Design an enzyme around this catalytic site. Structure first.
Site, PDB file in Angstrom:
ATOM      1  N   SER A  15       0.827  -1.210   0.000  1.00 62.98           N
ATOM      2  CA  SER A  15       0.000   0.000   0.000  1.00 62.98           C
ATOM      3  C   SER A  15       0.847   1.240   0.000  1.00 62.98           C
ATOM      4  O   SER A  15       0.412   2.309  -0.546  1.00 62.98           O
ATOM      5  CB  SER A  15      -0.935   0.082   1.182  1.00 62.98           C
ATOM      6  OG  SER A  15      -0.158  -0.105   2.359  1.00 62.98           O
ATOM      7  N   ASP A 191      -1.427   4.477  12.592  1.00 66.51           N
ATOM      8  CA  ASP A 191      -1.175   3.034  12.667  1.00 66.51           C
ATOM      9  C   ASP A 191       0.255   2.647  12.542  1.00 66.51           C
ATOM     10  O   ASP A 191       0.572   1.463  12.537  1.00 66.51           O
ATOM     11  CB  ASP A 191      -2.020   2.316  11.619  1.00 66.51           C
ATOM     12  CG  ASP A 191      -1.600   2.555  10.233  1.00 66.51           C
ATOM     13  OD1 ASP A 191      -0.563   3.134   9.942  1.00 66.51           O
ATOM     14  OD2 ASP A 191      -2.429   2.231   9.310  1.00 66.51           O
ATOM     15  N   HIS A 194       0.953   3.669   7.605  1.00 62.22           N
ATOM     16  CA  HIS A 194       0.451   4.521   6.504  1.00 62.22           C
ATOM     17  C   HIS A 194       0.570   6.001   6.910  1.00 62.22           C
ATOM     18  O   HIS A 194      -0.212   6.476   7.733  1.00 62.22           O
ATOM     19  CB  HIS A 194      -0.994   4.190   6.255  1.00 62.22           C
ATOM     20  CG  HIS A 194      -1.228   2.737   5.876  1.00 62.22           C
ATOM     21  ND1 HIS A 194      -1.674   1.793   6.762  1.00 62.22           N
ATOM     22  CD2 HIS A 194      -1.033   2.093   4.679  1.00 62.22           C
ATOM     23  CE1 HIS A 194      -1.844   0.636   6.121  1.00 62.22           C
ATOM     24  NE2 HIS A 194      -1.416   0.777   4.896  1.00 62.22           N
TER      25      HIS A 194
HETATM   26 CL   LIG Z   1      -0.262  -2.743   2.623  1.00 62.13          CL
END
Ligand SMILES: [Cl-]
Ligand SMILES: [Cl-]
Ligand SMILES: [Cl-]
Ligand SMILES: [Cl-]
Ligand SMILES: [Cl-]
Ligand SMILES: [Cl-]
Ligand SMILES: [Cl-]
Ligand SMILES: [Cl-]
Lengths: 218, 218, 218, 218, 218, 218, 218, 218
Positions: A15, A191, A194
């Site tokens: 991500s 978190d 991110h």
């Molecule tokens: Cl990820």
């Protein structure tokens, strides 16, 4: 500048790389590059080196481990005929150990991570001009926090593979650590994975440095 | 750096500034700062000068001319008690003249522009630590294109207001003009106004330079 | 049980409390109670003590600090004429200090926290049957993590307010700390604040214990 | 505790089991477990027995009869290699008889229900550590209401199969009946089938009791 | 027919009446009349008596009790200047007592029901051509089910109000009871209140009969 | 009553039949029957003859001509094994002639309509208990309006086929014509095809009459 | 041309005029002008007479009668200070009489129509450069269709108002009637009111002709 | 008029042709023709020549180059059996050179454009009654703007191909150039490609002229 005009630079990872990029092509438009460090890297290079006519593709996919990379490697890396490949993987390989501790099939432990990452590097190496290995990271300044500790072991593997294979190397953890002297992790990422724009800028800066564009204090 | 820790930096302008910022507050997260040069500035400063504890507010509103700035100035600038106010206005003041040539009431002609901008700067200057005047711009390298020529004239106003008021000054046109030696405008902005990430990076880099963080090649 | 049939129990707090509760009323169905510990408490009491005919209202609002509680206290607490008021506030009072370190106006420092919470408890105590003070919490087992340490300090405030006012008292931190002997925080909450169903169960179980329904192993 | 660490517990049934669970995998996240008794069971076990490292999968599907179970058994049960399988089916098999009385093809009458349910049990039994058979239920305290009457006959079949096959057994009807001494059915479920949080908690409690976690009044 | 051409017939009640009618006006198209018995009545009368030029307004609101009718009566009934007013209220007055047994303020007990309904009828009677009182109903054939028994008691109120005030009167319970000799309630309404098209047809047929259009077998 | 308990009645046609019915099954629920005459027919039969345990399926499809019917006949009629089949088609076959006069491929002219309709009837006739042929219609009282004129020729064909094949017959045009003595077409259907509830009730009434349920004035 | 450069032309009417125009302003882009004859007029004049620098505003509102025009005339016409006002109203004034025959309060009968339209024209005439009265229309070639006949009567009103006030005049009915020699109404408008692009072109061509741009065959 | 009744005219090109047309069929309805020049052409022809019973299909696709045309030619042109084919392509072939200067695979340079365009023409020519070649265009009055310059070279190729193959020819650039004597490009198209209604009207006018319907000043 390690990268030359007319060359194709391909980013792959999870991500942090993905950041909403266009699937499947991941090129043609910044929209298509997503909204994080990859897009930032391309934007900074266009702003400062607009004559560097590089083509950039984003093949990040949210959730991926090194296992997932291996499963898509041929289509998403080899078939794209890149000149330069940047890899940042390992966050999930570690994370799952901690967030889903009893779902052991989702865990990629260090010996497998190492070997599989090395395999991807050396399948690609003869086919490209160069490779940039970016460490995973965890936005946590306590080196004894269990997940930060594990992460650092993964990052040390990445560094060893880079040295062994003569790949370029970005220590993303060190880049975060410098800012964590000042900011609590939550200021960058709730978190611890991110991040905000600023965290993506930390990443983009660290990447750019290694390819020969070093952004420093005035 | 021109700006210090603990100081509030407020950006005001049109869509270039707005970039989807949170309404009304324009603060409290980068989501809240939008997705363009304001956010990039904040993120680059956090990445490189994390100990510079600036608080940033984005008061951009898409479509605004300086006439609209005046109408909201008390609530959106003065009442926020900023330390530094960054203004980038004039694109719409100009553009309307060319995209809606017959709707003269939507036009803000040079006399209205100069008097209103000047008045806002002089009213604000005693209340704040400093003002940064950024020129409008038009992403068009032909100085004789009519709208480019106009825009350059509005930029001359800005430059002279800033000289007179001892404000800081960013020439955004000159920042684009350097890139336009290489790239046709559509590579940065199909409509010559709203740019890609790279264009927002051009803007952030010009802003940063004027506040004492200069990003340069090497 | 501390609470009796026919009595109105009103919960107030931040997102942990809110959990998507119906606005403004926060009552009239569990949908209306949201999807976290408030609902779980109500459901466990109905399942196990269906003859305990309590009426429950959820006045949680995401993002709130105790400063926000004060601003809405007359309408959202006093005017509801509750019999029992459960307060869980402080997470945001603390978190802001660490996630937005430079936006000091969003911080609620210990002096404001103690004085405002204390004042709310003393104002409310004569008007109701009883008060239940629940500590904020941070799902982090390292007592020396800065935000955990802070949070523990705010929890000490709560504990002492409750002792002084003869309120009931739930130590939510201690409830999490027992589980954190086993699980890394990300297994319960990626951001260390907003937990899974299991975390809401930890909370409901601690609440219930203090009102005289103790769920234990066997 | 009947279930041990490292074991996989799989739930199958209709909407009461389903509760919005992630399809097809039904694992990886509580979101993925849905929002009813299965999620509650997992949450209560994590809150109270966090060292019990069980993996739980939800294969419930809204609308299913025992016929529908049989059609997906191989993929959704056998192929998942569970250690423990919990089954709750029969509500629809009965319901259709009453809500669609002339659509007889949708009805699963008792002799077929019995035989097919037994077949699923004994195909699974040699492959697993154990099986938990949960009765269907109908949230109606009048034993002579036609659909409650029918339901009880189905539940008696389940009990006989459990005894015959040495499966664990949960009488969900008895658990409801106790609360129906106090509450009218509508207080739990408008349609006498799909309950509130409280009803899901009744279910979770009854399940947990049978696997050795008994939640009692203090 | 009891109703004549050129007369305005206004229906008021709860969700049974509402059926998604247009707010606020409840007139000007059948879309506007909603999708239940009001629309069916209007459509059957247009199909069979198209020269009966009645104008129909739907003022139903989901959730209402007679207490809510009173609060809106001036605006939604009197100020519309109807010729005929059809009232069907009491389902919620009752249901709350059984679905939210402890939220006594949402209950409208028989004394409040009788006095408020009676008062509305007597206030309205001198202002209009006629009133049609329709009983609430509960789709449940067991007269000893508690909510059915209650509902029958509220229906007795309606019947006696209508006798006293010489209003027209529709016994909706008796209309359902005839069908319930054949069908279990779930065939008409899973929750025993909100029926299928067939249930709305039962209602329309009972309404029509009382205004002098009787639909009968053959 | 021509239709008996336990028999399956299947409706096929265009949008007038379709009315939003569930695809592909068109059964299981009134939602599934759509919101027009088919649903009305089922509702009226359940309200007045609830012991007539008929199963009804709606295979209408918006836009269809008789050509489209033929293309789906085997799957949507023959394979469903109906006892009774109702057909209403021709509106589009005609309409296209008038709304798309130059798109002649979309036109189904009378000789083809006749022959194809007859073919569907006589493929079905040996397989079923009976067939109900409903005429197309056009909600226009001027018999010389070009499209009403054409429509009537199609309807006369339907009547001839019904007589020739001993099918039941509904003259939907005659049913509309009676109401058009009073109402202008727009009061029923803006586009003279898709009617209000009332128009669907005209249809349902006409259908029911032919199967032996005749709704008349009191 | 009747209209000159620098003049403001304001269109007012019902949905035919509205066509999804921007509310409230109805100007500042063609998006803003909607997607029918107003936009087509503006676009044809820009394409063919780009030096005619007219500013155009669309104040159409779907559903309006002349009674609604009167209620908004000060704000939506007078206060806009137009130079030329184009009115097309009467379709709804008429249509209501035929689609809602019994809702007489929604009807605007000829006496109200004539007096209100006349009054609006006379009030406006001294304040503006000129007025263009466009007739309502009904896309129906049979002069004896009742609604067509009515509409023709309202059009006679318009024609006579325009003659008396020396306003410009567009006979939209006659424009449709020429095409209706060839095409059945459904080819232009299923409901005989709201036309295809071709119908809007008919309208724009009739408007343009009356202001001195005549589009003719060859 | 070059085109006769009963003939099929098919338009193909990029977004300027596409304009939201229905995929895949691009016929059956103006909605289906999209909202630009194709729809305008059809509307103007229906308004002024309604007896010209032409069938029109829109096969435009946003983003297309001449390469993309070639890839779909057989299905989208040849298989549709048109009588007349209109082609407008080249905008993207050029644009990409300027907006994505380093993505050279997306560029269609002039020799390939010419040859491929000619190939499409001469594959179609024997199969149709005629062909209309429309030049690409760029809404920019400076003949030395790099992209306008390139565009004109493409347009000159189109003209040569038209002459060589005896196709009809529309010089869309010349049509824009006339209006650009008066208006700045932004007044027609922010991005100098996708125009307002007026720009589509310029196109429609230019097309119509070449097929024998010439719209001139009065
Ligand atoms: Cl990820
Ligand atoms: Cl803007
Ligand atoms: Cl919160
Ligand atoms: Cl279910
Ligand atoms: Cl209701
Ligand atoms: Cl249809
Ligand atoms: Cl309208
Ligand atoms: Cl395009």
């Amino acid at each position: 500048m390690k990268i030359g005009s007319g060359e194709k630079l391909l980013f792959i990872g999870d991500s942090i790389t993905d950041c909403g990029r266009a699937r499947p092509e991941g090129e043609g438009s910044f929209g298509a590059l997503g909204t994080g460090y990859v897009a930032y890297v391309v934007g900074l290079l266009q702003a400062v080196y607009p004559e560097l006519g590089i083509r950039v593709v984003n093949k990040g996919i949210s959730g991926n481990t090194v296992r997932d990379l291996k499963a898509r490697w041929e289509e998403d890396v080899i078939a794209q005929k890149p000149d330069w490949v940047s890899i940042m993987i390992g966050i999930n390989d570690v994370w799952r150990q901690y967030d889903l501790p009893f779902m052991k099939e989702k865990h990629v432990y260090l010996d497998e991570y190492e070997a599989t990452l090395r395999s991807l590097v050396l399948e690609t190496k003869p086919l490209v001009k160069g490779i940039i290995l970016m460490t995973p990271f965890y936005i946590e300044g306590n080196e004894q926090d269990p997940m930060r500790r594990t992460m650092d072991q993964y990052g040390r593997v990445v560094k060893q593979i880079a040295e062994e294979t003569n790949s370029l190397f970005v220590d993303t953890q060190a880049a975060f650590n410098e800012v964590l002297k000042t900011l609590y992790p939550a200021a960058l990422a709730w978190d611890r994975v991110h991040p905000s724009v600023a965290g993506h800028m930390i990443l983009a800066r660290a990447f750019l440095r290694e390819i020969g564009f070093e952004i420093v204090r005035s």
